[PDB]
Design a protein around this nucleic acid. Structure first.
Ligand SMILES: [Mg+2]
Ligand SMILES: [Mg+2]
Ligand SMILES: [Mg+2]
Ligand SMILES: [Mg+2]
Ligand SMILES: [Mg+2]
Ligand SMILES: [Mg+2]
Ligand SMILES: [Mg+2]
Ligand SMILES: [Mg+2]
Ligand SMILES: [Mg+2]
Ligand SMILES: [Mg+2]
Ligand SMILES: [Mg+2]
Ligand SMILES: [Mg+2]
Ligand SMILES: [Mg+2]
Ligand SMILES: [Mg+2]
Ligand SMILES: [Mg+2]
Ligand SMILES: [Mg+2]
Ligand SMILES: [Mg+2]
Ligand SMILES: [Mg+2]
Ligand SMILES: [Mg+2]
Ligand SMILES: [Mg+2]
Ligand SMILES: [Mg+2]
Ligand SMILES: [Mg+2]
Ligand SMILES: [Mg+2]
Ligand SMILES: [Mg+2]
Ligand SMILES: [Mg+2]
Ligand SMILES: [Mg+2]
Ligand SMILES: [Mg+2]
Ligand SMILES: [Mg+2]
Ligand SMILES: [Mg+2]
Ligand SMILES: [Mg+2]
Ligand SMILES: [Mg+2]
Ligand SMILES: [Mg+2]
Ligand SMILES: [Mg+2]
Ligand SMILES: [Mg+2]
Ligand SMILES: [Mg+2]
Ligand SMILES: [Mg+2]
Ligand SMILES: [Mg+2]
Ligand SMILES: [Mg+2]
Ligand SMILES: [Mg+2]
Ligand SMILES: [Mg+2]
Ligand SMILES: [Mg+2]
Ligand SMILES: [Mg+2]
Ligand SMILES: [Mg+2]
Lengths: 55, 44, 119, 117, 110
RNA sequence: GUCAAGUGAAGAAGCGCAUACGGUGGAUGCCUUGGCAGUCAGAGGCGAUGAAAGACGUGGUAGCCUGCGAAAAGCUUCGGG
RNA sequence: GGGGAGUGAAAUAGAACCUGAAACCGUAUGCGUACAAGCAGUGGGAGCCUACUUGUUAGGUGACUGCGUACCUUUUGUAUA
RNA sequence: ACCCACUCCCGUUGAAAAGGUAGGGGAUGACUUGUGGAUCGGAGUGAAAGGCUAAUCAAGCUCGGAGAUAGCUGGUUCUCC
RNA sequence: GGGCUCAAACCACACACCGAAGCUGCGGGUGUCACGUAAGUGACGCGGUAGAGGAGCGUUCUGUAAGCCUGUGAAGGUGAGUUGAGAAGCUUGCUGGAGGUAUCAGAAGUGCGAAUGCUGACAUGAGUAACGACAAUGGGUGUGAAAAACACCCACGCCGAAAGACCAAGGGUUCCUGCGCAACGUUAAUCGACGCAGGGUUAGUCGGUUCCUAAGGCGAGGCUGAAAAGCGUAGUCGAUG
């Protein structure tokens, strides 16, 4: 099964009207002022104030 | 699945090599044709 | 449906699933802090936490039960010599699952699994 | 001796596409689609020079009908009255009076009513 | 002023890279950098490098402040494709297009 | 002011047309390194004194082309310059 | 891979390099577009926007509405499924 | 084992231009197999199916006659009177 | 179709009106005749496939042209305006950076949307199917810009008449080391049968060569055949022995 008619560029872009990416939930640590994913250990290795991975 | 090319350099030489071509008159014609066209490789 | 069912398939056979979580729990007892996927870390709770509960009572039968479920002499020794005594007064919750980011290779949600008292 | 077609062909295709400006999709971008649209638009435009005269006359007659019925006459009776009394004001001007100069249109309708009887 | 950085021949599709570009268009550079640092897309790793290279151009060639800059213009253009052959089931040969794109980020204080 | 009835902009997930600026692509123009066809001549053969055609070598530095042949991008001599 | 600097008459002549068309893909702006049925135009036509010539103007868009079933070929005959 | 290919299912833009999984037949013989060799285009070879002769067979492939022939199909390009 | 019934039905009569690219009006073009030895007037025409007849536009080249235009900007490209009945012409902004060609003639590879046309580029499908045996992974450490895939360690799993080790054929440097990651690898890659460079293969006894022959080949003379050749003796090759 295949198209009988080439899909128009308007119709192609209309299907893509649901393709937009969403932004993640970003939080800021208070011990360091560092940006991290909400509910995730910070890239430096802190979660809710304390260092957990210690690099 | 066995395919048509089963290489044997000895069989290749004895069927298509330079001395196989030079042995006959139609073989010499192949070498004349391939020299006239300018083939870099003459036989195999 | 999976109404009220427990467990994660994790795209594995049950033999491989059993072998992997026994490997992971042994690794967690040795290192006290490991990184794995978040789905594996959440299912590792139900395997590794009953082993620490068992290790609180040191006996020949409990140690043999530990060895049947870990198949590791080092893990059995650590459970009854260190972890069983360390968590004697802790009523469960010996593990901590902390979400790290995502794996670079496949964007898999990562988690840190650490023993609660000291990792 | 040898004649390249590139320059002349590009000029031809650009004239067509310039005429297809404002058309949807391939009708303004693709030559062999735009060529059909430019021809069809030309067929319509020729036919609608004829249709415009019909459309406007139907619009004048409808407005004259509305204006004359406000004055107690139907369109057909007003035209017959405008022939009995030799008034040659055409329907384009009559429809302009019926909208913009209502006192002038009333005077004409009264002149048609008197002529009928 | 407006400063730009351009990455030509980014080995990713223009369609894929435009999803990330639509997220950072019109944003302050600091916010856009934090969005790109935590995105799961491959285009965000590439886009973040172009964005911070544009920020560096604005701070060296023009002497600006990162806190005054915002992403004024970002667009992704299609680049050169690479042509490849993939075998199919019955001797059929299929052409693979390996798409690349040009990523232009412009920062401006204004 | 309250209520009722009537009327009603702006707020586009995306899309269209126009315009501007790009990208891709490599048309067009202009150009020529190479061809095509003649005209007038030349030469009308080369080879067991080893041909046509090659292989492998040959250079300060890897490869390929050109030349050359263990005397190997060349040796001797006679002229030109 | 770029941004400056510099070279150059010219670098959007920067080595995939003269010119640099079209398809095709974008970004920006203007107008239109979420109660509406079909070859997508054409006739009429409001509003909005822009520019001066300041409304009998030019450009862009175009609500709403009349009419309207591509082209080629082949055929007695084709919107023709 | 090896040779084979009876059934089903899968696969049918396949992992595969003939396969796979599960079953199946022969398995000291008119057996299977390696290396080398002989026979070929109105010719070969055929425990015979018009089978096979390099994924091509009621007469292989390749070049030439050759731009075969085609009362057939398709296509045939600027303007106006 | 809505709806319609002393009709918005049917029968008869009458007066109106609507209605086409028909007719008339107004302006314009053109054909043929006639008058004009003129510009032009008059009359009648002017839908059209196959097809006949007539009149033109434009493109490339040659002559006109050792001319004329052109770096104070050619051709080409891209907009705007304007002229003609049309093919089209002309003027100009920008781009471009060295060529172009008036006029009138002469020659044609002279005009493209179709031919399941040919070549290249790029779309749609669609960021979809798929990522090639369902033997299987988990963790720690290192390195690195970056690690699910690289290296190491601890576990787990798979083959084991092979998924291990060889000889032959076939391939030909893929072998090892250092450096490296664009492309290649159906993902990433620091890794590689990938890129750059260097290194590496040592025989009286292994295998060839050499000796000997099988099938079969070639084959001095020879016999045969229009030619080309065919066959074959002496011989000489030819391993799989
Ligand atoms: Mg439950
Ligand atoms: Mg899965
Ligand atoms: Mg089992
Ligand atoms: Mg939007
Ligand atoms: Mg200068
Ligand atoms: Mg130049
Ligand atoms: Mg260029
Ligand atoms: Mg609406
Ligand atoms: Mg619709
Ligand atoms: Mg109009
Ligand atoms: Mg209609
Ligand atoms: Mg019929
Ligand atoms: Mg019809
Ligand atoms: Mg059809
Ligand atoms: Mg249909
Ligand atoms: Mg049986
Ligand atoms: Mg039969
Ligand atoms: Mg066959
Ligand atoms: Mg025959
Ligand atoms: Mg003939
Ligand atoms: Mg023919
Ligand atoms: Mg009338
Ligand atoms: Mg009329
Ligand atoms: Mg008429
Ligand atoms: Mg007239
Ligand atoms: Mg007529
Ligand atoms: Mg006619
Ligand atoms: Mg020219
Ligand atoms: Mg064309
Ligand atoms: Mg045609
Ligand atoms: Mg689909
Ligand atoms: Mg799906
Ligand atoms: Mg899938
Ligand atoms: Mg695989
Ligand atoms: Mg990388
Ligand atoms: Mg093996
Ligand atoms: Mg190696
Ligand atoms: Mg890769
Ligand atoms: Mg290598
Ligand atoms: Mg013989
Ligand atoms: Mg003899
Ligand atoms: Mg011998
Ligand atoms: Mg032997």
């Amino acid at each position: 099964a295949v198209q009988q008619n080439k899909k128009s560029r308007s119709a192609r872009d209309m299907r893509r009207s649901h393709d937009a990416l969403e932004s993640n939930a970003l939080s800021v640590e208070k011990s360091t002022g560092e940006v991290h994913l909400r509910h995730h250990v910070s890239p430096d290795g802190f979660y809710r104030g304390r260092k957990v991975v210690d690099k | 699945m066995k395919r048509t090319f089963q290489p044997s350099t000895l069989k290749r030489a004895r069927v298509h090599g330079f001395r196989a071509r030079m042995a006959t008159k139609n073989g010499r014609q192949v070498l004349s044709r391939r020299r006239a066209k300018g083939r870099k490789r003459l036989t195999v | 449906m999976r109404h009220r069912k427990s467990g994660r398939h994790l795209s594995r056979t049950s033999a491989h699933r059993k072998a992997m979580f026994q490997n992971m729990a042994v690794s967690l007892f040795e290192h006290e802090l490991i990184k794995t996927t978040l789905p594996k870390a959440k299912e590792l709770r139900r395997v590794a936490e009953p082993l620490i509960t068992l290790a609180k009572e040191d006996s020949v039968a409990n140690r043999r039960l530990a060895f049947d479920r870990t198949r590791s002499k080092a893990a059995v020794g650590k459970l009854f010599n260190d972890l069983g005594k360390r968590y004697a007064n802790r009523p469960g919750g010996y593990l901590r699952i902390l979400k790290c980011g995502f794996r670079a290779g496949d964007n898999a949600p990562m988690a840190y699994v650490e023993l609660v008292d000291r990792p | 001796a040898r004649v390249k077609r590139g320059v002349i062909a590009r000029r031809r295709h650009k004239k067509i596409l310039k005429l297809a400006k404002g058309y949807y999709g391939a009708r303004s971008r693709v030559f062999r689609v735009a060529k059909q649209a430019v021809i069809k638009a030309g067929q319509y435009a020729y036919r609608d020079r004829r249709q415009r005269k019909r459309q406007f006359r139907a619009l004048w007659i409808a407005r004259i009908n509305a204006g004359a019925r406000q004055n107690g006459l139907s369109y057909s009776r007003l035209i017959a009255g405008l022939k009995k009394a030799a008034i040659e004001i055409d329907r384009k001007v009559l429809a302009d009076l019926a909208v913009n100069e209502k006192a002038a249109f009333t005077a004409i309708v009264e002149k048609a009513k008197a002529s009928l009887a | 002023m407006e400063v730009a950085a351009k990455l030509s021949g980014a080995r990713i599709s223009a369609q894929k890279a435009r999803l990330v570009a639509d997220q950072i268009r019109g944003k302050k550079v600091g916010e856009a950098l934090n969005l790109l640092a935590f995105s799961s897309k491959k285009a965000a790793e590439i886009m973040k490098k172009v964005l911070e290279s544009a920020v560096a151009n604005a701070e060296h060639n023009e002497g600006a402040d990162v806190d005054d800059l915002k992403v004024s213009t970002v667009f992704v253009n299609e680049g050169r494709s690479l042509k490849r052959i993939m075998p199919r089931a019955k001797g059929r040969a299929d052409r693979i297009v390996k798409r690349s794109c040009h990523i232009t980020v412009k920062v401006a204080d204004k």
